[model samples]
Target: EDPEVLFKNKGCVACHAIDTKMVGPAYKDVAAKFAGQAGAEAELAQRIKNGSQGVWGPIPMPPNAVSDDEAQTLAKWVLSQK
Candidate 1:
């Protein structure tokens, strides 16, 4: 499935955007922030499912309801943004 479609279907667009900030950081920035980290994909996949805080700022990202596979896919797509 298209990762963007899954992104929206999972309600991530409420706070995250591909190119710019919403309630959360832009996908590009996220990709940039985690770029070249050996565990970026794995860490992002977990963060997407378990929620995150103090990483991007004061605004905490709520835990998502997506399955582990969906989270991994979304993480991959987010990293591919920039």
Candidate 2:
């Protein structure tokens, strides 16, 4: 399967989707929010590692146990959702 598909299957679906909001922001929302921003990849990776809240309301994304490479792959996939 594609790595993006793997990300979806590996429980990211519980919190996120391509076009709709769920426990977290929609992927398209995220992509729009970060588009054309400098250092977005690094910023997003940090968030994935450390977790973040407030920007998308109260519920926070838990720190991912995924490795840096995995996180980068996921971030890239998410930003492409638009």
Candidate 3:
């Protein structure tokens, strides 16, 4: 399955971009921030479920209703970006 396509199909593309900042921070920035840490996948997965804020200045990343597995996949995909 194509997670990149899933990203656009789902709610992520509303605020996030692959590289540059839009309403939220870039996926690459997210990767750079959380990529190397242990449990980063799970952490980001939770953030996907729960609305995200305070991590960045004014960028609002609200809750996403995607499944737990999908959230994990999204997090993993995010970490895989440059």
Which candidate has the highest TM-score of all? 1
Stretches of candidate 3 exceeding 4 Å from the true structure: none
Structural similarity to truth (TM-score) of each candidate: 0.94, 0.87, 0.89
**Number of backbone collisions per candidate:** 0, 0, 0
Clashing pairs in 1: none
lDDT (0 to 1) per candidate: 0.90, 0.81, 0.84
Better of 1 and 2 by lDDT: 1
- lDDT, model 1, position 69: 92
Candidate 3 weakest lDDT stretch, 10 residues: 56-65
Q: Taking the tens digit of each residue's C-alpha lDDT, what string does model 2 give over 10-79?
A: 6788888879998989989999999878889888878876799988898889987777877787887778
lDDT of the structure predicted as candidate 2: 0.81
Candidates sorted on TM-score, descending: 1, 3, 2
1 versus 2: better TM-score goes to: 1
List, residue by residue over 1-82, the lDDT tens digit for candidate 3: 4778779888789888988988888888989988599998899888987778889785657788788888888888999995
Native-to-model Cα distance after best TM-score fit, residue 5 in candidate 3, in Å? 2.1
In angstroms, the error of model 3 at 52 is: 1.0
